[PDB]
Amino acid sequence: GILKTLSAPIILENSNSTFTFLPGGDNFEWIHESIMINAFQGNTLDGSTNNLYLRIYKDNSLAFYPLIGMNSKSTIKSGTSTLIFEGTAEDISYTVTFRLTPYGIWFWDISLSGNCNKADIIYSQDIGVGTKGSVNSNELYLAQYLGHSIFQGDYGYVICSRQNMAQGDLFPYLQQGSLGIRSIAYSTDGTQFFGLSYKKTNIPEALYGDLPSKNKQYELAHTALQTEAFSLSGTKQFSFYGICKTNHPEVIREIEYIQELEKAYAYHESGEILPVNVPTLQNIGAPYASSRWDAKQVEHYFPKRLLEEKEEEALLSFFTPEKSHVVLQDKELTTERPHGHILMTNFDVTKVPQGVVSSTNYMYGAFNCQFVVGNTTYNKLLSNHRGLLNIQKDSGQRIFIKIGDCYRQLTLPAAYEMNVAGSTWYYQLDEDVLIITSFAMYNRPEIVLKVQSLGHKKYDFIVTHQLTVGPNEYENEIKLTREGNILQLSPTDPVVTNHFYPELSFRMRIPEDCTLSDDSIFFHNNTTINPSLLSIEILQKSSFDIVMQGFDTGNVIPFLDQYDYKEQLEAYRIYYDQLVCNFKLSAPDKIPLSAEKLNAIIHWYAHDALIHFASPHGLEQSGGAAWGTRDVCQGPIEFFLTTGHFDLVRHILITLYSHQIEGGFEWPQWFMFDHYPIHQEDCHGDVVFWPLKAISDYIQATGDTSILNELVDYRTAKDALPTNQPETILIHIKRAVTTIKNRYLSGTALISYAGGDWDDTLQPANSELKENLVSAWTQALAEQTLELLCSAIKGIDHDFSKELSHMANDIRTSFYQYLIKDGVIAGFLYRESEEHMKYMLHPDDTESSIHYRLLPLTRSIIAQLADFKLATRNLEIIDEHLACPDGVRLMDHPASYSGGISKIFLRAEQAANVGREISLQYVHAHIRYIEALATMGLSKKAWDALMRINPILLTDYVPNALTRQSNVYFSSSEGCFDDRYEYAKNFDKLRTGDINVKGGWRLYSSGPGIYIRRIIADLLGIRFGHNVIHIDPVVTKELDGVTLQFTCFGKTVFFTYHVDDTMDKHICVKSNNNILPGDNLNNIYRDGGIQIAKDVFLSAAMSDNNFHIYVKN
């Protein structure tokens, strides 16, 4: 069987515009010249996110009715550019006329007939305002750059929106308002309209009240307008309108296009407008959310609880001794981002993995989205999760359960339990509990769904699956075959449609007695709308399973007889223990809370880091697949070096060097690491340093200078294909170093900024800024990297090593000579020539509102480039200008924002949303601050900083932090500022904790891996070198008497810490009371740690594996 693709059957056209709808009149794709206007495509079971609601007020009730889409009771007629919806709501008769005019302008003309005392209308419209590709790739991201301006016109509120992030070359625009009726209130974000409560109730919260009339610049661009209320006795008529422009290079200052709007309003099509068939749902009800569990029920299902989070004495979340994290219903209804989880199969940890199976799931009944095998974008069976509030709830795998006469889609459970192997949902039903589990198999490319009635009661179910079989829903036809209870799914025309994985297939094992269809079973007349919705009806069962297999290379394996969760959980526990070298903190007395948070989080961060490495995607950032060049060089390499996964790092490095670009001899920004030849050949200015630093770190850790002699190819810039001109890794390095030498500004060793540094929002706004800026952060990184390379290469190429030392020293000299003034490292220097220089992000830049930058302060310290005086000053500057309760900030003031046009920096001046790097607390940079503090031996500050970004019981540690998912990494911390203007004005509230702060994007980040390295290597102080162990703790007094279990060179040992201010030496290490000999480490800021030979360490370990570490702060 060939599954066809969904095509929207209602197609409205007019000059430069194609607006399509599903048969219920739900929005599908609204396109004006290449610009997609809506944010979300409707689906055949939920409809679309937009609507028009009639509300009727009575003395004892408020009622609300959708007028459009499949949830209205509307009949529909269509012409070539017009739709007419007709129906009744109570005893009001209505018509809604949709018009698509030639002017990139549309209208919803409403007509109401009847008799009632008080009514109003709410207009509701999700908005994208980007190319179709940008919208599809990430709606949240696109929304962040969509800047809303609010005005009063003739008929109250009008909302004008400019997309600040370039779409092709264009800055597109929307305007929305009302005509013939006043819009008395407005909102601009989906969180305002639907509310968090929607995730349980399935009712938009705003429908019960008044819109707030505030512009919230967040991730769910969603315009709502509320009319003045009116009585009806007779007929009343009025319209809403929209305007789309593909390019509006200026900032928005006023209502525009008034004359065009008037011309468009006179527009009517000449053609006939004829009835069309509207399909209707059959015995399908509203969604089903579980009732909440009370304290007694929680206690019964979860008797053993740790790290309990409570708010007003109600339990929100907790951890278990089995290493699970459990989230109770009330917590999800208070987190702006939805609780979720990524499952990933195990792989051989000595090699770069391939064909790794992954799946995403979310608390609110998204049981399996984005099931993939290998490439997370292309090698996909199930559609991605989108949005935040589950308005569109048809993606991936979903479950309907028959309650009374009606199938009801499961949404919000009573509890949601995550472990590294699986997720479990607990739904309270009438006198029963339904348990759903989606879990990864060990050693097999499988995810398994199990459904179990606890009371062994029988139910009817429909399990739906929005198929892709490729990167996107609705894009390609699918080949589906069935042999008994085994389905096989694969792309049609696999060689051609997939040159690179021509054998890509999937299989599903389905229950014995089930029937198979598309969405036809949902509809009264059995009409198929979406043929790629794979529906499985399972009648009168108390349990069932669906087993899902992925094969990137067609190595099909038979299904097991029994699929047991517990066995997988046990195998994954061991794999994750080994991955972190059996890390475990203990004490004989009460373990300190900080240590208890580290034991709980270490395995969660290891999982996040391993995903970031092997299966590169996140929760919000679903579109990844590739390795970022600077990304793989940080989180994964630092994680793997810390835990002794050296063979893996070697293989990563070989793969990485194979992706260096022929000719330019830099790296791409990102590249696929599988068989897909895709990369981004244009790079930022810092990227080149990262593979150089990483190979040098690898060489220092292992002594494996052999890597330098490996013969390794390059890739071509344009088509990302192998060049078949291999050279030694040493020569790869020499070529990359030449690109660095050629960046010196003339007369100096100042490294030109080029395409930007670490901060992707700080790309230069023009070519003069690109050529003439110098990033002090980049300068410091260069110095550091070239010094590290010098050492790594010293034994192999004496001469190149001397040239590397000269470079590093000249860079060092220029750093001190040009980038420091009055003891303050400037964030940037602008140097057109010796005669025309200007500091930026420095106190001398008195024109600017920004006078301090974090990044150079931390990197200069990490590298031991900053002398003690400068390091000490750096820390005072942080304390006085950058330090907040939620961590250290990237600058002392926000980047400029003046309506979206860039002057100096690109995305930093374009983002309308206070979030991501624009939040100024980008957690990765805070982690480098921790690293800097550790380098300086400042244990109190370091451990305090470690805790400020630890999501476990975060609200207890940082009182102004809003709670968020406690078992996942959060990438940023942003003040609750609705727009950039308020953010600038009341910025200082961040320093003093007088504004709440909330978490950013989850999971996908270098953070988890570099956090793990801070914990183990820098703070606990256990680091590895060539046949040596380095012991160099930076611990507080509360770690006195605490022990770390850690596997060293394959031997489990126990490091017990003693903090002793009265010692003579800085450090002493003892086993069986014998002092271990070794040499002192080099550190310009404090007394160094100790280097102990591996044979010596291991010999002591054989007699007594309890090492006692005496350290003086």
Ligand SMILES: OC[C@H]1O[C@@H](O[C@@H]2[C@@H](O)[C@H](O)[C@@H](CO)O[C@@H]2O)[C@H](O)[C@@H](O)[C@@H]1O
């Ligand atoms: O997706 C928005 C996000 O993109 C960030 O950049 C990407 C990076 O995180 C990822 O590792 C690679 C490979 O998939 O693609 C991109 O370079 C960017 O740094 C952020 O500013 C944006 O928020």
Ligand SMILES: OC[C@H]1CNC[C@@H](O)[C@@H]1O
């Ligand atoms: O701009 C800060 C960071 C954002 N995510 C990708 C990283 O490579 C980058 O440094």
